[PDB]
Amino acid sequence: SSDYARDNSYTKAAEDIDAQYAYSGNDLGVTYTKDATTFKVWSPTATGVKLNIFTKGSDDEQGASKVASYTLEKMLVDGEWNGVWTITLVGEWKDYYYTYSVTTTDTTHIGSDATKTYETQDVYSTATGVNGKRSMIVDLDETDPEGWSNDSHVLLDKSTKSSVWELHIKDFSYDKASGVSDANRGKYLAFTENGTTLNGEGKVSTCIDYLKELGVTTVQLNPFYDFQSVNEAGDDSQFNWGYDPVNYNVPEGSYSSNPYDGKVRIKECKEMIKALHDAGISVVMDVVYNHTYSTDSCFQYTVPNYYYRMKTTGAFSDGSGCGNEGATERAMYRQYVIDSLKYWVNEYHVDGFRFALMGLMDVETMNMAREALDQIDPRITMWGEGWAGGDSYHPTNTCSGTKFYPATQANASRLSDRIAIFNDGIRDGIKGSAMDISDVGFIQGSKSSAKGVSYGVRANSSGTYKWKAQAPSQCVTYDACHDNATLYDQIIASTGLADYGERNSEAVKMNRLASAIIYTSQGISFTLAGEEMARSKDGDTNSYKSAANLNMIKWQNVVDYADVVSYYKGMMQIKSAFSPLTAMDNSYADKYTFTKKVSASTNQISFTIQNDVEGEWNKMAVIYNNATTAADVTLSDTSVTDWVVIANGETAGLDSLGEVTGSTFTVPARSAIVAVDKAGYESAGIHSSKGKVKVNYVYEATGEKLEDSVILQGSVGSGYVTVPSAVIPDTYIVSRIGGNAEGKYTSDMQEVTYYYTDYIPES
Template sequence: MRSTKKILASVLAVCMLASTSVVTGFAASSSDNTGAVVNNYALAARELGTKYGYEGDDLGAVYSPEKTVFKLWSPTATEVTLNRYATGSDSEKGAADLGKIQMEKLMNGNEWTGVWTATVKGDIVNTYYTYTVTANAPYGSVKQTAETQDIYSVATGVNGKRSMVCDLSKTNPKDWNKDKHVLLDKQTDSQVWEIHVKDFSYDKSSGVSDKNRGKYLAFTETGTTLNGEGNMSTCIDYLKQLGITTVQINPFYDFQSVNEAGSDDQFNWGYDPQNYNVPEGSYSSNPYDGNVRVEECKAMIKALHDAGISVVMDVVYNHTYSCDKDDSCFQASVPFYYHRVKPDGTFSNGSGCGNEVSSDFLMTRKYIIDSCMYWINEYHIDGFRFDLMGLIDTETMNLLRDEMDKVDPRLTIWGEGWTGGTSVYEKTTCTGAAFYPAIQKNASKLSERVAFFNDKIRDGIKGSVFDIKEKGFIAGNASNAKNVGSGFLANTTINNGWKALSPAQTVSYAACHDNATLYDQITASFTGEEYGKRNESGVQLSKMASAILNTSQGATFYLAGDEMARTKYGDTNSYKSSPEINKIDWNNISKYADLVSYYQGMIKIKQSFTPFNTATNDYASAFNFFGKNLSGMANSFTYVVTNNVEGEWNKVAVMHNGGGIEAKITLGDTSVSEWVVVADKDRAGLSKITTVKGSKFTVPANSSIVAVDKESFEKAALKDNRGKVTVNFVSGNGTKLAEPIVIQGEIGKGYQVSPCIEIENTYVIDRVIGSETGVYSDTPQEVTYVYKNYVPESIEKYGDVNGDGITNIRDVTALQKLLASGAAIDNKFDFNYDGRVDVRDASMLQKYLGGYGVGKGTVEVNYYYNDAQGNQKNLTPSVTFTGRVGEDFKTDEYKVIGYDLDKSKLPEITEGKFQYGSKIVVNYYYAAGSLDVKLHLKHTSEEWAPWLWVWGADLEGKDKGNYSGGTWPGKAATMNADTGWYDYNFTYNGAGSYNVIVSNNKATQTKDYKYYVENEMWIIIDDSKLDTGDYLTFYTENPEVNPNAPIAKTLSY
């Protein structure tokens, strides 16, 4: 690479010398003298590095106005042709074939380097090229010819199939020479916000111009505000106010899964690399011109740097989109070298995506390091997040760390310390060193500045990512406490599956792009609300998650929008879902302003207290934990942390109560006589909320308290620099209808508040006292929403019974006279919507005039069955709901296996209008039903027989009975030759629902699909998602017969 100079020469020399002794020590045979299987494919491929390892930094197309030199490392090739084109595709205007050149072998004296080269004289900038490579596999009989783009491409045409000759100096945005890395003194100072380029600004509420929404250039727009209204900051300005130090951007190298020439509503996360050193074209304003994507990507990075925000690039060096010669430049250039191959000649698939990269091979390792250093030097990237880092060997990661340190040791690396499947690799690397995958348990073999995502604290906080309905510690699941407890000290003192060398080696988080958003999991497991709807309990749990992360050591990481209750509407694998599912809805910064304020305040607390943000183990003993063992079950944690840094707080008490009731906590540290609370269930920051004398605290359910000893609080006098707005919700007589909400923000910046959506809609806003939009100031402000009772439309329109223009007591008298007369009465006077006009309507009108609320109606739904003794019982608890009088309601039957709706006793009404006065009661009756269940399964592409593990759940959702033999992995479904579907049938026992796991005889196991109640379902296996564990879709009708077949519903317990 032109930017890396020759920094790798010494590293590669070591690899070549060491691997010489390794390779020559083995014969290319099927077994060695121990009888262990020898991987001839790996041995032959590794020998290529030994014999033809290339140290140069000039692979690819090296451009100058005088000439362009092309070099391709392909030591198994027998012929290579350089193909030149005028455009990046044949469909463009001006497309032309500029000719072909036979490339020659590059010699070093009498020795071939393994490199093919060609030189084109003159200035050919902005033209395009490919290579046609005829090559053999290092081992075996495969010989292939393929046309491919350059592995070392720095720019490409549309969709990345042709490389471009690029003058990188002409792709720099204005003042690029002044742009510098934005680096933190400690990796653990990082407050990371994970974002996708398109998610960031796709929604119009972002305030970004239409032409730039979803693009690189969205990041360059400053001064953006919510819906462009000029008040609340969005995008980069919002991140600065929130306290974010670092953005981690989902893959923005060139990936394959989006058609760059297609419509803007395409979406993919981008974990399918095509050209590692080229920015993705769909995020640019012109994907056809290779220069544009480069310049606009640099402009994005510069805009973030100008805002003081560090940029971490999400990289996927563990696998490529394809390992087919027609879709992979790596396989086309040197077949079966850049990917790990198993002894049987098939590709190892530790990624779950069909292949994995051979990081332990000399030239693959060189490529990974070259590529990273290229992004650092050419694009000023500040760090990397390694996807499935467990597929990269520790030696490669440490070598990369060494090279990055030569630029600046503050450049960051973190990654996923796991794999996506079983990886097959050699026992040693190209240096002869033992191969250790960069997984969590091998943390000690990595630099402590190569960090791991801490999945333990993630699952501890919110519940398992593999079950959106599992509760975490914050929702009262005491069994998840140990995963939180080990995370307080960044997994440095407790070996909870793995142990970090120091806090610098840990990234603490509760959610990321994978799986459910934090708020969605809270919704599914705890509140039971519809996705995307505000729930005060859910907001409180999210606040608690932030409190845990920011009172724990390690770098702190958030999925973008966690702090504003981001939803993906329950989609747990949105990698190719629509932008509408994935986008950031910036309206949430107003709807959840108190939650944003809380995250902002907790960030300030962590940034201000060294024991929380330390990169070293120096403060491990400063954490004094009280009560239960950190590794056991618990509903709460309490600890006091002592600090010796001048100018900071001395002692901080932390109390986390995940239980469903308030906790009375007495601190074990009695040396402090008075504490200042800086975070509670509602607010957080550097300012005093209240004081507590002594050591006794009351911590509300599902919340946290952070307190500082009063003496050091006053001495440090840390400035919060935020204004406060309190939002009240009261009735006309002053009665509190909902708890006040406190929002905080940077003084001088805008705020916007909203009504409380949890207040029943039988109240309506009468007036607002104070300003709903304004600017934070030094002086605390208040906004009060005053509500009045909803008045049914019937009274609003027809309450003036006597027609005198006003509604008063005389209208009650007029209606009473009409009723007494016995004359026919217009049904419009049916004020209470019970279907008739009678004295109850006159009474309702009188109550309304007397100031009583008459706008709420109630519906109760019961579900009954008779047990074996003939006793009537509830099949499930009764459901009661309310609504505005006169508005429509609808009830639904309850469905379970074992009972069917008794059609001889159907309810008189199942839907209608809410009535004032008497409660509407709807009764559903059930009789014994069919217990036979038929499941039909079909693949989208593969053919293996699905194995099913099926078990029941009783009417309370508790596990009951097994319907697959009782021995894992259960039983295989049977192919039905007539239908082409696999069939699996069983007979249920009792009543309830059933749960399903599908696997390929234990492999590629799904998550638990729970609480199904259909007697027959058609199940589609999406083979493109096998690696996710979430690849089944359940239909109640055959989707091949009915393309609009309904999705099967499940019970919620």
């Protein structure tokens, strides 16, 4: 909750080590050629460093042998030691594994006889064997897949033009119904599989083909650096999010087809990224420099008590709530983090980063990292959690001698406006407190939550409620992520409308409303992968090590909630057509007219946005109605009185859904209206290229609807599958179908009617 500046023996010692031994060299770890291989280790605390060579990454493998051990020597600049140990092995050392045996004091007993010896993999490992205990010497060119030389970054012109899909690699394709091959389900190489369909029946698209259709700009991948919590030699049914770092610069083994050979995971990890780039998707990497799984790490075994934040009592500061904190303010951890980021960008073609507990990382380091990545390309995205997971004890100043500031929401002003911050303001505003699955926000009917949404609409960059972003560029707009409950699960829990993962019409209405808010709000639009298909975790509010089949994306939901997918798909189009919504800066802040005060307690939020981009819509009107009844909303902005509706309770997109004359709109219960000026709609010529299918549910005898009709919307020639309504009482059964239950989208709207008759459920 709090951070404390406390200077002590540990911090002063570490600061002295930086002053004398800070090494800006580029070459720590292994420098490989066919002719020789050089090893470098930074450890001013050591009295000796020994290199151990092996044939295999573990002793259980066929051919496993200790080759030899060698003595590293102190590296001398003049006649002076720079803190670096080095040796050069002459010959071909490709595909050998190694550890270091480091004999070392701690930071507060340098030059003393109080040493211990630790065996460790390289701090600067670029490859490891199974479970990351032994590093591997590799020619990185050999790990490049076919086409890798032609693979470019996929970068957004502006971060605020993004639509982010937060995905776990196992979740993506562990489901058998994903249509991914037995070999590749839950693995890096699932992303390379094109033409995948539900149950491989060839009717409706899944996985990579689904993402192309959905139109997400960005996939954010949950930890795919090497973590501790999956035994890579164990069973395929294991699951962890992987916020348990062991090797920061090595891919996770369990997502590969072979973790024993250290080259395989690298190649396959690159194939995943290439595949996403080929589909025109940007790749954002979840990174966790804020803590390591344990202090029995390569860092601590190489330079004890340097790389972690130390309290005066000798205890490790526990700001992460996982046991330790990485000391970003230290010269050589700062350098490690920035070099690591550059490595993932250059070597793996990563396009941006999501920083776990960014509130533990110091502002100066984050700003230097932003600067470093700008040298590559400023379009490289950065965002993080502007909070910590416990009390943080740090030195007063950084290694540069500037005051320490944590990169929290409170210090947004001190942070680059292109290091964005998760907006828990709009998160809690939309669906209720993330700390309480049963708590209600705006979509469930909270009037007091309205202000959270209203401040969220301008990315908490206009006025101050809870926290203030510098600009929309500094704000991630979201209602749910991997943490806590899924949107749909919180809707279900807070209302009691149904069981977890069961379709309910009112629940789905609330889900559509949340969609409307996210994509008519400024900042970087962000969803949990499958939010658009009503993803459930069966009520699990912390699924980090829960069952694999619980966590996995249920691909059947692309059919069961096809209409909801279609709604998101359409809302995404609206945001990307109307420039004020994807603004990086504050230039549109004074162009909003809210009908009520932003801080108002209300069932209906409405606002207009004046645009200034030629060839776009001139003005947009947006209305959220969380009431259980229809509401007539009259805009305070009466400058436009001819409107074209482009999203309602039924559908969203770029096509006209009907017109409104005047300043008053009828908004159905628990739904949104998005309208644009008539003149602008005509002149801009913005229109949908997507086909539509309308699904009706009719009592055959009378012709009355048993349930509201729904709208599917997708690319022309792409496959769709409709189903009978899941919510219709069990005393009705489908007697016949009119139209094509399944087929392909056309330019013309197609209709399917499920005709119902009287039924009594049997034994």
